[PDB]
Amino acid sequence: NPPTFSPALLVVTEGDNATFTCSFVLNWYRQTDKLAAFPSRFRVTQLPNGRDFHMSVVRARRNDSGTYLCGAIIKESLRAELRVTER
């Protein structure tokens, strides 16, 4: 039972926060590059139910556009796309 990463597509404007959800050590990946881990602009917050996790990009930049996923250690999730439109 690998984790689930959503939304499959998230489009935000530069300046706002891009928040994903990983449901299931938990690692946030963007080959894979580790962004954050549970327990900078990439923060991971556990939800009250304990099984869901908010993975937010505080003040998303244009170059943050790409594919993201989360993995539990190494079972990985599907890849979600983030788009950051110019302002």
Epitope: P7, A8, L78
Partner: antibody, heavy 117, light 100 residues
Framework: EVQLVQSGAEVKKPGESLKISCKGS????????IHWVRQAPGQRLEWMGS????????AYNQKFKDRFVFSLDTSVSTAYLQISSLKAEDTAVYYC??????????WGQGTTVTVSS | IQMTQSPSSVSASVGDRVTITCSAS??LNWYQQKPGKAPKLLIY???SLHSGVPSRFSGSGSGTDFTLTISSLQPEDFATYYC??????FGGGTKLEIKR
């Protein structure tokens, strides 16, 4: 828990119109793509296209461009496949599938479409 | 962007190891479909097993060649298998039948 239920079988005439429904349950419908796949009788699977419940992102196989249209209903969590100017070559089994931009991880049970005079 | 799924059909017995190949001309997903039923996702990202897929299913990929392997065949594994790459495109399909 993740279920995609499609509408019943469709028996139409050449030149009519139909709209297959695809209601998703057990997940946030607005967070995942909806893909559409066609399988002619005894043939292989062929990807028709996909549509996302937000931002208006749609992708179409070039064979099913202007005659096949995808629609969505976010507040009710239902996907739609409408086909106009129906032809006899459209007789196939049409699947809707939840997934991402590149994969289909949960499939509907399918809808058999028969078009004949 | 031209993939070829081989072979068209495989005959094997319960307990055998079966390898299905999809080769390109210049990641891959694998699906399983039984007669009259909807397909199921088996492998994503070339080698990651989907939720609920038994560990006897495994995938690998080296450049232009990708293989789906079923280590020990069970009675439930006889079906048709499709590889899919990404516009999404399915392979030709491989029917796995019972040998006798």
């Amino acid at each position: 828990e993740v279920q995609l239920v499609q509408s019943g079988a469709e028996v139409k005439k050449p030149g009519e119109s139909l709209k297959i429904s695809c209601k998703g349950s057990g997940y946030s419908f607005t967070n995942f793509y909806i893909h559409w796949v066609r399988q002619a009788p005894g043939q292989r699977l062929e990807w028709m296209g996909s549509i996302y419940p937000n931002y208006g992102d749609t992708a179409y196989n070039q064979k099913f461009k202007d005659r096949f249209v995808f629609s969505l209903d976010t507040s009710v969590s239902t996907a739609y496949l409408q086909i106009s100017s129906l032809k006899a070559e459209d007789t196939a089994v049409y699947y809707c599938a939840r997934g991402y931009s590149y994969a289909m991880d949960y499939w509907g049970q399918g809808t058999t479409v028969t078009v004949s005079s | 962007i031209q993939m070829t799924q081989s072979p068209s059909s495989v005959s094997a017995s319960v307990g055998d190891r079966v390898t299905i190949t999809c080769s390109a001309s210049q990641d891959l997903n694998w699906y399983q479909q039984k007669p009259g039923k909807a397909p199921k996702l088996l492998i994503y990202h070339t080698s990651s097993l989907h939720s609920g897929v038994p560990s006897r299913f495994s995938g690998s990929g080296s450049g232009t060649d990708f293989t789906l392997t079923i280590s020990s065949l069970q009675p439930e594994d006889f079906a048709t298998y499709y590889c899919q790459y990404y516009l999404l495109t399915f392979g030709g399909g491989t029917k796995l039948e019972i040998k006798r």
